[PDB]
Amino acid sequence: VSWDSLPDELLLGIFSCLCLPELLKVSGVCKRWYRLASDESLWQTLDLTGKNLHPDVTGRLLSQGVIAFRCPRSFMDQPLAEHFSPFRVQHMDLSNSVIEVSTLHGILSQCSKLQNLSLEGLRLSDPIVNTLAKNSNLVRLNLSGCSGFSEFALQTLLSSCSRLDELNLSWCFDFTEKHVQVAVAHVSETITQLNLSGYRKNLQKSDLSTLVRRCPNLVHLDLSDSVMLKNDCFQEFFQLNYLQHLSLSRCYDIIPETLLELGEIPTLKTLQVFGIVPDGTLQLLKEALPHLQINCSHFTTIARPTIGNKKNQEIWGIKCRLTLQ
Amino acid sequence: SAGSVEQTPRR
Amino acid sequence: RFEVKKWNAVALWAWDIVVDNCAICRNHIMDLCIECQANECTVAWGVCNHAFHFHCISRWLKTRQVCPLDNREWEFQKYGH
Amino acid sequence: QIYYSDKYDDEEFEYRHVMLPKDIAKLVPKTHLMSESEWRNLGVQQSQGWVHYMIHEPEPHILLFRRPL
Amino acid sequence: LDQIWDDLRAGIQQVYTRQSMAKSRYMELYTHVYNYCTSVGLELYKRLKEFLKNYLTNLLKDGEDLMDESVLKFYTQQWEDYRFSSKVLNGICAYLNRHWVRRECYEIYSLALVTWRDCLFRPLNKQVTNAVLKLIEKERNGETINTRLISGVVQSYVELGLNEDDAFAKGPTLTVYKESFESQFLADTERFYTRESTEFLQQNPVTEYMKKAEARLLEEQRRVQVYLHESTQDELARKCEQVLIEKHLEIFHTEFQNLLDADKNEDLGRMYNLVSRIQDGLGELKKLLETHIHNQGLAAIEKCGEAALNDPKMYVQTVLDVHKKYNALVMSAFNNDAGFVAALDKACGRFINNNAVTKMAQSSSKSPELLARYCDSLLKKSSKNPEEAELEDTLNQVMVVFKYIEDKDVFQKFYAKMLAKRLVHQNSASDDAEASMISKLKQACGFEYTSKLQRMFQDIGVSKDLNEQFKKHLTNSEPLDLDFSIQVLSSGSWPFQQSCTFALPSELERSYQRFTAFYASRHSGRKLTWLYQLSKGELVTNCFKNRYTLQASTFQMAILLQYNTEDAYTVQQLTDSTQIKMDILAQVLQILLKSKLLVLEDENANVDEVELKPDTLIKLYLGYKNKKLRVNIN
Amino acid sequence: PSIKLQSSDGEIFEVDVEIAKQSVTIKTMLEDLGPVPLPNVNAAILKKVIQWCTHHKDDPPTDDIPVWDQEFLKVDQGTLFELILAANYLDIKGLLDVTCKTVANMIKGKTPEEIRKTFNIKNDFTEEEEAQVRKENQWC
Amino acid sequence: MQIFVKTLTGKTITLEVEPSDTIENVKAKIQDKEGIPPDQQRLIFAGKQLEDGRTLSDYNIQKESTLHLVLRLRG
Amino acid sequence: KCKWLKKWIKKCDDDSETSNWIAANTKECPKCHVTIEKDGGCNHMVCRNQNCKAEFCWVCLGPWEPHGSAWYNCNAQERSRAALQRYLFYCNRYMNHMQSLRAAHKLYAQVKQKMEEMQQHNMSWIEVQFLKKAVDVLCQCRATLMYTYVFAFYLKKNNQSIIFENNQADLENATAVLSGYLERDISDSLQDIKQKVQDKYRYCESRRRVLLQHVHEGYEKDLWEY
Ligand SMILES: [Zn+2]
Ligand SMILES: [Zn+2]
Ligand SMILES: [Zn+2]
Ligand SMILES: [Zn+2]
Ligand SMILES: [Zn+2]
């Protein structure tokens, strides 16, 4: 009958088997339970997508020891007014979420060990990305479709980080050939997954030549809907004897014949060329090249938070534990 | 010796 | 007197022609042709006292119709068996 | 078929919500949003700048793109 | 709480120095360490750490500095007691290992192990190891080792592989062992063996040294399984092999030379095993072996000398005997080699194709000729009939000594000529034996090599097919008086010349024309060049009172058919009626005069040296008496 | 074999050895040092614990807990509490986990004051930070 | 010991060469001497189309051995 | 005979056949007259020079009016085109034999490794012996087949040369099959491949002997009309 003797270990064991609403309800019992309701193990993984809630609340609930926070397509629409230690979290995704740049910088000022990162759709500034430059341990990066960032701070960010192996940077309207110049000049050449699609008259073949001559190991390359990558570009693709993903869809100047030279590379596994090869002759491509999946993977999964089965509440295999049904 | 026009189509 | 009781002898079967090179496959006529050397030549005779193989003159006569030492049409004269 | 609409727009950007039939509308994922080049690969056509920018839960197979000036 | 710590320390002191701990006391201790921890127990962990350090130092002060045979007896005994006591202790206070020590963001038994890792780093890490080395240097003699000491020491060194926060609980983490026992062990083993080997190789012959070295290697590989840990096997074996051998290779080679000079075929296998153990060392034994066997075989045929030049069988038997003995040897030296076999073959080739017989004959092609003529003498229809079970075996042997030869052209020519003579004169032992010979020759050197001989067989098959059918055609032709038999050759295969300008006297013409009409009409076009110079026959010569008969070729047949009318002709009358050349005529008349059926002007003069011009009378010896009829005058 | 265990209040219950080799503490008893008194386990609580050990002697070794606990743990309140405490004491992993889940399913859907009522847990840190901590998690 | 290349203005020019050069580098040399577009060019020597892959001695271009150049107008 | 060999090797871009390539597919521009080769098949070209502003197809060689309109549409070339084909054929196979002769060293190393591998695969050094012999005779066959081509160039075709060409073709086919065998099948048909290789290289050696005999016969009886 004596509750007053049950220890911290057993009470934490009980609280390890509760759902978020009741868990937050019972935090209001006494000071002891208040300490117990935040023990850097209950809050390991959290998911609060869709919401529009208080920036100080999310700052505290990130300070309490989350290693993987999943919250895309959400709002936190109020500025931040309290600053704490550099946040320990290592898996941050804000893909297509909506939030003001002030709250963005207030939260990203404490980025320390962000192993996997995604900030699709949001507006960022040069101080924001150069505070992101603190993280030299980032591996998966998805900064597609941002606005306001500049080339100088971009390339300083790339020089600062060193574990660049996933990079999804498609449809950032302010990318140019000088942007991809600084990109190749400052990324770690270990990179193997790169996305620079859609920039029809923003990129240039010579910068791709720089990318492939400094990066003979990249495997997953994406520059679709970029007509300004002429046929000699294929030659530089012919340089890469390591590629397995290659997306150059929507390139009118390309032909089904010259792209056959890419199939001359046995390492080429799948190809995403939707549009350049019309119906009928793609089967001839398949017959002439019998180990290539031409236009069979409609999307790339480079540093994407989730993919498949249309439920997939997990993120990169790190299943979140606490959510709201 | 430009295709697949990516303009907004008809109603 | 009589002394003729027993006799045994040997004779050399040879093609009835002057020097035997076939002038095409350059083998000995009694020897074998291109095909009959690299894995059944008989002798086909010409109407102008020339005679060659089968595997050789058949091919050359399929290609052109001349006797290949003397500009003149080719027609058979005698088979070989 | 692929039903477009008028240029109902926000203050600065411009929207035009589209409607897709069963076959080309039965592959939109509940997970995340498509890249503009991604739905170009899937074959939808419209003008330049139309990024797939949000999903509305009541209409899962009915897209609402975005475009700049 | 401190009202419990004294009783709990009393219990812990009781569990060491194992006075048979009771169970109720075990509940008292566990209940104490539990009811304290649910009151968050770092102070208890520090108390245990300091208690273990205190006990360990108090134990270490006792028993230090016992140079040998006691530090083992003390070390291992206290190690066993301390392991069991600390294991039970870790059993007592498991609650700390469950809750508190789980928050590590230090496990009791591993704590005790780290604490004893202090007593390890002492001169106890030098006295114990050095005493282990000095005791295991009872390899030579003194065998009351009592291996329970070394086993305990080694098990302790392995379990004391450090574990604290390496990554997790690891276990077989042998680093302390590798850096505090093994290296000194290998150094001392190298020292011991490099002493003993050069001590032993001054008072003994090496033939015993290989025996002792094999015993030593097996002994080390044996002791590894009984004292130490498994992962020393390959390294210790490599060190022992690098010391016992791989430094005495010069002596091994200079011994192999004289060992191969004699014929000891057992210790050679032992030296083989030893030099095989090390990497890529054999490549001097090969050169010595092939030079030896080359010289051996060359001197072996040098024994027979010139007296074998005219006797093929002895030559071939000598060479094949040399090869037999040394292949029997290399059946044991390198265990059916790929390289010693190569040395064998190089030497056999180099002394078959160039050696004393062809040294004195000035012709490198002499040896294939003698091999071919040996096969001839083997294949003829001799009287001392070789049975088949030896016949094909001997054929395989000849094919061996063949396949080492290379000048296959001269052998083809000689075998062709001799098979030609053998088949024309119909003096064959076994046609199926010839067929087996030619078939295995074909599979030895392809189809193109054995074409002409295949013809030589098939066309005589054709003649055997045609003769009897011509006789059947002859049932209606009445051949005048003679048994006719012909052999019709191809003209490219069989190496004969045209003729000697004969005449074919009167009697044989009918059969000649009848047969050539039978053949030239049964086939399209064929020009037979009838050669008589090699065509035997028989006479009945019924001018005698005795009815003698002679076996003679067509030349003698015509010379005597001349005698059908008269018996006292002259030389030129025969010469114009037979067209014989002068030398053939001289030879045939010489052979005729070797017997007395033909007589010159004299009767018993020199019948070998006379050379008379055609002005000379040739007379039948009328009253001719002979030793016997049926004489091969050839 | 066999083994008897003394209660904390005197009574003794004969227990099969393989039955009482579930409790990891008693298993490490009979592993080294192969009437044991248990001082922090009430008698009838030990009776219920040994009943549950008996019926689960053939174990293979939220979250859909099996039914026999629901017709077992149907019992008064503090008795359940001391079941949980004894299960933590003897390290009976099975009954510990099932009672943890039972408490978890019994805490859901109650006001905090009824929580401190049934738990009989006194209420400090009150009427001064109540609405404040409510605001700290106002979104629920 | 040089190579001569037919410039389109006549006047066969000379270069400096090693007998194991690369045809793309010879294209670089001739473009350096003129400025001609270095992708629409075919080299012709001994009547055979000099490709880009192998070396001069492979197509047996020794020293003081002229060649010729023709354009590859893409319409 | 070395006069014809000196003439052949004295090519210096062959001094003639380059002009045949000029007459093959080069036509001067109607604005900046220079050796110009159309490629492709578009038949709609603009003279891509630094100064030339004048567009024209290949086959007009004149007014630009037709293509784009309906004005005219293009209203010893072949007699010298075949000579280029023959010269390319002969010099091409000459160069093929030269190239496959220069790589003898790697061939030696490959066959030595193959022979060692077969030797450790249960056979004596005899395997190495006959593969070395096969390699030697193949090299000799190439070294004489090259010169049989260079002779088969400089002569006027008569009744006999067809036979000579046929024999060279057969010998070349045999040599190709032998090189194929050798580099293809060290891997376990060792007895069968020993049979095949032995027969093939014996046949090739005999056949080359025949070709040399035929050539010397032609020099003797004086039939070769250049
Ligand atoms: Zn022929
Ligand atoms: Zn034939
Ligand atoms: Zn004729
Ligand atoms: Zn022009
Ligand atoms: Zn035209």
Residue numbers in the entry:
A (entry chain T): 95 to 419
B (entry chain P): 163, 181 to 190
C (entry chain R): 21 to 59, 67 to 108
D (entry chain K): 5 to 73
E (entry chain C): 17 to 55, 84 to 149, 157 to 685
F (entry chain S): 2 to 35, 38 to 64, 82 to 160
G (entry chain U): 1 to 75
H (entry chain H): 316 to 390, 403 to 514, 516 to 554
Paper text:
In the TS2 reaction, ubiquitin is transferred from ARIH1 to an SCF-bound substrate. Dehydroalanine chemistry linking the C terminus of ubiquitin to an N-terminal acceptor site on a peptide substrate enabled capturing the catalytic cysteine of ARIH1 as a stable mimic of the TS2 intermediate. The cryo-EM maps that represent the TS2 intermediates of SCFFBXW7 and SCFSKP2 show the ARIH1~ubiquitin active site adjacent to disordered substrates recruited to distinct F-box proteins. The arrangement of ubiquitin bound to the ARIH1 Ub-guided helix and Rcat domain is preserved between E3–E3 TS1 and TS2 intermediates. In the TS2 intermediate, the Ub-guided helix is reoriented back towards the Ariadne domain, but its trajectory is limited: the ubiquitin-bound helical structure precludes the conformation that is required for autoinhibition. The switch helix of the E3–E3act super-domain appears to barricade the position of the ubiquitin transferase module. As a result, the ubiquitin transferase module is restricted—but not fixed—within a zone that directs the active site towards the F-box-protein-bound substrate. Notably, the cryo-EM data for TS2 intermediates refine to several classes with slight variations in the relative positions of the F-box protein and the ubiquitin transferase module. The resolution of the ubiquitin transferase module is lower than for the adjacent E3–E3act super-domain, which potentially reflects relative mobility.
Here, by studying CRLs in the SKP1–CUL1–F-box (SCF) family, we show how neddylated SCF ligases and ARIH1 (an RBR-type E3 ligase) co-evolved to ubiquitylate diverse substrates presented on various F-box proteins. Notably, numerous cellular neddylated SCFs and some other CRLs have been reported to associate with ARIH1, an E3, to form ‘E3–E3’ ligases in which ARIH1 serves as the ubiquitin-carrying enzyme. We developed activity-based chemical probes that enabled cryo-electron microscopy visualization of steps in E3–E3 ubiquitylation, initiating with ubiquitin linked to the E2 enzyme UBE2L3, then transferred to the catalytic cysteine of ARIH1, and culminating in ubiquitin linkage to a substrate bound to the SCF E3 ligase.
